[PDB]
Amino acid sequence: LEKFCNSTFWNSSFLDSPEADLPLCFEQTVLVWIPLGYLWLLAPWQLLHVYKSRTKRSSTTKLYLAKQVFVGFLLILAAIELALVLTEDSGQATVPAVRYTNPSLYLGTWLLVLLIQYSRQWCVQKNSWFLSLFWILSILCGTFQFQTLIRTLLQGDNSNLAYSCLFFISYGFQILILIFSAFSENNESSNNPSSIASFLSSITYSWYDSIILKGYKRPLTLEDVWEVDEEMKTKTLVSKFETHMKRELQKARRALQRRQEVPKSWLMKALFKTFYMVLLKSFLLKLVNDIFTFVSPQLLKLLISFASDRDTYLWIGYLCAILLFTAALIQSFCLQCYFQLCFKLGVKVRTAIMASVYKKALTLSNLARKEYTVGETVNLMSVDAQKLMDVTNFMHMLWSSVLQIVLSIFFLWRELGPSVLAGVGVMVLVIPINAILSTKSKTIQVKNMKNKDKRLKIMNEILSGIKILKYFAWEPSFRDQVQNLRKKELKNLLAFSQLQCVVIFVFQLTPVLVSVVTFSVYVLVDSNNILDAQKAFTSITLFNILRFPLSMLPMMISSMLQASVSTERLEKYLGGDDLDTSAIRHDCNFDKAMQFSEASFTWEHDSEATVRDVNLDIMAGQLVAVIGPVGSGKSSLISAMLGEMENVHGHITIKGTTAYVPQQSWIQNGTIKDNILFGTEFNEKRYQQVLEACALLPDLEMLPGGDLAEIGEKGINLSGGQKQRISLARATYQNLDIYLLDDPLSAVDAHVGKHIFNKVLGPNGLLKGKTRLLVTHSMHFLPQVDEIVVLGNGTIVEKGSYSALLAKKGEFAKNLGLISSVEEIPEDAASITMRRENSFRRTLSRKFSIYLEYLQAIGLFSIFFIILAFVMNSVAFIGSNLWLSAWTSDSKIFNSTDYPASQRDMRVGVYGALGLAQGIFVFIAHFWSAFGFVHASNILHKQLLNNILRAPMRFFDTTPTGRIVNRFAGDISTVDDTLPQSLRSWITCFLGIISTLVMICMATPVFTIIVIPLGIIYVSVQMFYVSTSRQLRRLDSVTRSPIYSHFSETVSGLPVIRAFEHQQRFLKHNEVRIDTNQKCVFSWITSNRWLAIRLELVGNLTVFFSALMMVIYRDTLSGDTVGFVLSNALNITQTLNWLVRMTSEIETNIVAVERITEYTKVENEAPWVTDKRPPPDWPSKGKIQFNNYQVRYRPELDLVLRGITCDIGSMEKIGVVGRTGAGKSSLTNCLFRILEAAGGQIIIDGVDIASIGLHDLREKLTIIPQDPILFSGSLRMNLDPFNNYSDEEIWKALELAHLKSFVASLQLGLSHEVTEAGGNLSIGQRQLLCLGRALLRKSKILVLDEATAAVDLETDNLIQTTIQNEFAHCTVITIAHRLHTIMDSDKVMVLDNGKIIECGSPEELLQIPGPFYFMAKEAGIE
Ligand SMILES: CC(C)CCC[C@@H](C)[C@H]1CC[C@H]2[C@@H]3CC=C4C[C@@H](O)CC[C@]4(C)[C@H]3CC[C@]12C
Ligand SMILES: CC(C)CCC[C@@H](C)[C@H]1CC[C@H]2[C@@H]3CC=C4C[C@@H](O)CC[C@]4(C)[C@H]3CC[C@]12C
Ligand SMILES: CC(C)CCC[C@@H](C)[C@H]1CC[C@H]2[C@@H]3CC=C4C[C@@H](O)CC[C@]4(C)[C@H]3CC[C@]12C
Ligand SMILES: CC(C)CCC[C@@H](C)[C@H]1CC[C@H]2[C@@H]3CC=C4C[C@@H](O)CC[C@]4(C)[C@H]3CC[C@]12C
Ligand SMILES: CC(C)CCC[C@@H](C)[C@H]1CC[C@H]2[C@@H]3CC=C4C[C@@H](O)CC[C@]4(C)[C@H]3CC[C@]12C
């Protein structure tokens, strides 16, 4: 190279000076060879890759011509430079070839740049990574030439000016070209801008931000979320996975058959063989990032060394700061891309498993299907697949730990020595302790869950039946009855809370402990050891680096253990056998549409044949009926026709299609029209005919929505009579060839059955040509059939026509969130794991004022002290660092053989004391925090319960029960579980950040300036993220439940699905429903990565400046002062991301307190007890009177009852009777003050009901409930919750009620338990018991109602007479509809539309014609 060039390649004199620079020999050689090599070496492929995939050229845009003209300018500039150089010196001038090759080289390269750019015009991504990286390499290499050239000229030499000006122009044009090579230049494809995006946009995610702007202004819906790429569409992933699954299983089955004469491991392989490439790429990226994790500490040590002494050069510090900035930037850019790749792979695996499970479900054999449960398979897809997604989101950790740890350990020893082991051991002993406490926490949480479940069950009953409680005034008892359970749960909650505090304490103080032990052991083990700043601060940095893997490796091992059993379970279902179909021949026999050649089928595998030796044939257009006894096997025969049984001997010939009407009707979710259509083009000449013939017209008219009324699990639940007619209508509208009806006229009555038979299926009906096979139990329609068969014991006994069988004279005669892994937020490694586990376990079972309110519930007195403790801990932290910074500074004064013992002891005793103080203050803060919450949950729930239990009926009527009960279950769980964890983590993160900034600003009072700008950027970048992520969190939940709903529906109705041959439609529906959720998950997976690049950039900028500010003031700075500032600021990048993410969860979770508060402040009704007390034995006589009583249910609604003036005498029986909508039932709800008194008043015993207190009036009144309701518990609780009576008087009551026979001979006496609404008891005694309930009170005024409607005749009679025999010295008012029953009333009151009309004796009312007489004439009682 010496003869090629003219100057020396490298000499110490070039450097080793205040001013130092590489010569124009090293810079004009290697620095102009690296950039060219990258372009030349890796061009061919980047042309082969374009050559094979050449498509249509894209329209030309201004950017293209600009990029082409700038390169042309470069070309002409290089050409003119070469010409000038050649012309300058030709004769007697041995010009070095550095002036010949370099010019020519560039001229050669620019040509390739022009060509490669044109070729890109024929691909999707125009600006790829190749050129974008080339330009950066060129600029970085050419900055050095620019650095020296300028100096040479500035120094004062004028020898070379053309070259400098030429080089300067080129360097600029290069800058401009790089700037132009970043614009997206989009084709504006509505699918997604991810495919069309330059390198820089696709590496800083500056294309998602459009959505960030769209969601900030207005709420965003499913329309404006970009669709997923084709490579991820469900249809594509399945095929790819299916190929390898099919290829593997067969080999696994062969291996299992060859040996041991149910596969063992195939799923895991099928996944690796399908997705190895993404694994390889992610592994490479993770390996590259793993390197930067240990690069920083070396630059930090270099900074400490440079700042320690004084006789150095500034360039060293400036270069080190620039290198630190660049390393941080590169590490962040690589890490984000690795995260994106891994999470995308996880989503792909989850979709490819869920869709494949769904596709198998509808082709599995009957045996395996009957082995499983309907909910079990849904839980299988909803739980197993999700578990596999997690173990594929964090697998690379396994290898990225055993390596990281090793590397870290190596650095430590080279830095300190064997003392390091002391720290590691203390950092290893923590994990064992952590386990003993997790097991205890789980043990407590199990009983917590059990007691919580017991509490909610009583809540549901009282909320649903709030009417009966109000009538009998039983509210006070349930208060304490539920408060007992509340306290019993609260004690366990407090125990669990204080246990969780010990765990956070050990994970919180471990950094200081390891530091005190390591430093003390190192300095005290040998007198020769001297502590210096570089070693100490670098050791701290490596300890902080190593602290994570040793704490995530335990978690990863536990997760893989769960995924093992999850995989094992799925492989049984996805590898199950298929039903056999080599028994039904779909041939066009034509001679017959059915043939049985001595068939014999069995339900089980090899058990007894349910159908044995059956042989029959029926021609087309023949209606034949199959009859027999119970358990004969008809439905088994029709299922064998469908082919749902295992063949044993014989074959069945079927011509044409088939239609099925199952005995147990199956109804989907949706409108009635959708169910009737069942995937068919809508018509008008047939739809109307079907609905009318099936007599589904009158009922449809009565439905609230008519034809478009939502039916199914989440809608009107129809009865057997209707659901059967809907199924029959669907079957008859689909219009197939062969109909197999299984008892379709059982739920309907005689009229509807006759109409359907004469209009739909029969001699003259819709299906008059198609063959019909009907199974029946009624002999009413037998004469109108063609042939009948009598099945017996699974075989045919007699087959013949109606007349023939009757003539045969035999048997017939008698017969007729937002978190994906624990690597993204490593500090909160535990809480995240617990939340996942809790959610998985819970799946199986199934204006700043609110912050002030929650703090007031907690208690501000304790809040002040807790904040004081946390703040004091931060001060003790900064204090310890300054003591070390002083301790490390101490070394320069002394030497190896001058260190005294007193200094050695003093420099460590104080360090130990400060560590102890830090530990104590944290422990105290955590100790109080736990209690400060258990009290909050108690006051919030108790306060809420008393208020909600006292609300008037309006509120209970307007709001659905579901909303009210959810607050008592979900919110209370949220307010006492995750809430405290986040509320206690956020303050720790904020105080850590604040403490770090005080330290840097203290050392450099100048730093205070940068704080303001960063804050404005931080709080700005912050609002944006939350303003969008919150909305996407909701969309995801709304677009998930559908999938599991669909799977449950198809699994339940498989035979009907497979009888109609309608599987492709359902597969397509499932594929669409999966692609809707797969589109929404990615939209938040990308957003999290957007925030990171922005915040990691901010966090790296705030440390770059600090470093530079300590090089311009280094004259006044020591080596240690440049240690505590950088050693801490090095970990401020990720803490910002953690704070934003954690403050985006606390904000979403505070919604719980808000809801609870609204119901705690619901309007209340009149006070229960007032000072006005009634005279003793107030209801002495039954004297009621109404003075123009007028009332309205709600203020916005009009008066329902008006102008009421009647008199009620003592010991008088009154019958209230009227028309519909006359307010008869309102009269009762007016005597118990359930409503108010818009006009008039009610006076009883001379005392207006208003004056008497609420709970003081109801006690002395009795009413028989309209719908007898029985609460859970024991028989004593239903009869007397208040345990006021004794058993003796109770035992008399059942004797009067004719129920002592049942209760005396029961399993127990009065202590027998009852299930829900008395489910254990039968209907007969449920209505009877409520009679006895009211009997015990033996009040004076009894308000009866029409509640004997479902009471059986004999029982009814008993009830009627019982009333007369027992209630004689009392006043009885009865609202009834049995006009006949109303005959003995002393006065009969008549209501028309809310006005008293006739008041007289029934004999007088009938003697004189009138509205009552007209009603009796219509009724015909007399
Ligand atoms: C790794 C690089 C890129 C960044 C780190 C800073 C580099 C440029 C610095 C740090 C320490 C420096 C060395 C320190 C001491 C000497 C001895 C002297 O007689 C010749 C220069 C030499 C050998 C220096 C060369 C430049 C150097 C290696
Ligand atoms: C666009 C970027 C990449 C250019 C980077 C190089 C710049 C920042 C550097 C490289 C060489 C530097 C020059 C080197 C020497 C001198 C002479 C001195 O008496 C004043 C400063 C001055 C004039 C420096 C100014 C800044 C400078 C021009
Ligand atoms: C590594 C890449 C990314 C950045 C390169 C930055 C280079 C061009 C910069 C960084 C620090 C700079 C040096 C800082 C200080 C001095 C002392 C001055 O009297 C002469 C110039 C000199 C010696 C500079 C030369 C150019 C320099 C080395
Ligand atoms: C070049 C880009 C990429 C990085 C930025 C580097 C900056 C911080 C560097 C590059 C050139 C440097 C300057 C080069 C020369 C001098 C003259 C000297 O008497 C004081 C320092 C001073 C003024 C330096 C300050 C720091 C400096 C401006
Ligand atoms: C140990 C516990 C009791 C500490 C309590 C700390 C209090 C003061 C903290 C915890 C949660 C915090 C809130 C969390 C989120 C936000 C949203 C942000 O846009 C404005 C500040 C605001 C509204 C915070 C205000 C201060 C806050 C209420």
Short mmCIF file of C-alpha atoms and ligand atoms in Angstrom, two decimals, residues 140 143 314 318 322 1104 1108 1112, ligand 4:
data_model
loop_
_atom_site.label_atom_id
_atom_site.label_comp_id
_atom_site.label_asym_id
_atom_site.label_seq_id
_atom_site.Cartn_x
_atom_site.Cartn_y
_atom_site.Cartn_z
CA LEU A 140 -20.67 7.76 8.69
CA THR A 143 -17.70 12.38 8.14
CA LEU A 314 -11.49 16.29 25.55
CA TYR A 318 -16.72 13.45 23.51
CA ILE A 322 -21.25 9.73 21.24
CA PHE A 1104 -26.58 11.61 26.66
CA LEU A 1108 -21.73 15.87 27.94
CA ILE A 1112 -17.57 20.68 29.88
C1 LIG B 4 -20.63 15.26 14.99
C2 LIG B 4 -21.98 14.84 15.57
C3 LIG B 4 -22.44 13.53 14.94
C4 LIG B 4 -21.89 14.74 17.10
C5 LIG B 4 -21.75 16.07 17.84
C6 LIG B 4 -20.37 16.24 18.45
C7 LIG B 4 -20.14 17.56 19.20
C8 LIG B 4 -20.73 17.47 20.60
C9 LIG B 4 -18.64 17.91 19.16
C10 LIG B 4 -18.09 17.78 17.71
C11 LIG B 4 -17.02 18.86 17.52
C12 LIG B 4 -16.77 19.35 18.93
C13 LIG B 4 -16.01 20.66 19.11
C14 LIG B 4 -14.68 20.59 18.37
C15 LIG B 4 -13.74 21.67 18.80
C16 LIG B 4 -13.88 22.42 19.89
C17 LIG B 4 -12.89 23.50 20.20
C18 LIG B 4 -12.33 23.36 21.61
O1 LIG B 4 -11.47 24.43 21.95
C19 LIG B 4 -13.47 23.33 22.61
C20 LIG B 4 -14.44 22.20 22.29
C21 LIG B 4 -15.03 22.25 20.87
C22 LIG B 4 -15.96 23.46 20.74
C23 LIG B 4 -15.79 20.92 20.60
C24 LIG B 4 -17.10 20.80 21.38
C25 LIG B 4 -17.88 19.52 21.10
C26 LIG B 4 -18.15 19.31 19.61
C27 LIG B 4 -19.09 20.39 19.07
#
